[PDB]
Design a binder for this molecule. Structure first.
Ligand code: WIF
Length: 133
């Protein structure tokens, strides 16, 4: 029941500072432009210990399945090949991605009727807000 409040289908409703976050990550111009336009759906489900997060957009479709605390390989929407570990910290899903000696952290939390996603790369944060579809 660890992630019950995350389960469901979510639609992006607002974004702040995502272009700057993507720049800090190293995303190139054309990908930033096309990824920045998208309004992805995020579909979260749980089966036993396995959590699945799928993102459906006009830009890319991504999917990760994972067990908390257990490192996995991820191909990001911008085509980075990263090593990811996701844990629960005080009710927040904390997702760390490592690649090329770099690191970024994505936090997902429930706040009121929203699912709030905070992406941090060094000093730069982006906030992406989702509501139930
Ligand atoms: C490039 C990028 C995308 C995402 S994303 O919010 O998950 N957005 C997403 C997921 C599938 S398609 C799609 C999109 N914008 O088209 C994140 Cl968190 C971090 C980075 Cl660097």
């Amino acid at each position: 029941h660890m992630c019950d409040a995350f389960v469901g289908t979510w639609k992006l409703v607002s974004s702040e500072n995502f272009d700057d976050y993507m720049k800090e990550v190293g995303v190139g111009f054309a990908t930033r432009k096309v990824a920045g336009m998208a309004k992805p759906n995020m579909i979260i489900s749980v089966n036993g210990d396995v959590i699945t997060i799928k993102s459906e957009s006009t830009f890319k479709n991504t999917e990760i399945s994972f067990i908390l605390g257990q490192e996995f390989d991820e191909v990001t929407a911008d085509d980075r090949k990263v090593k990811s570990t996701i844990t629960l910290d005080g009710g927040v899903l904390v997702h760390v991605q490592k690649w090329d000696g770099k690191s970024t952290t994505i936090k997902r939390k429930r706040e009121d009727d929203k699912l709030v996603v905070e992406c941090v790369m060094k000093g730069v944060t982006s906030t992406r807000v989702y509501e139930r579809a």
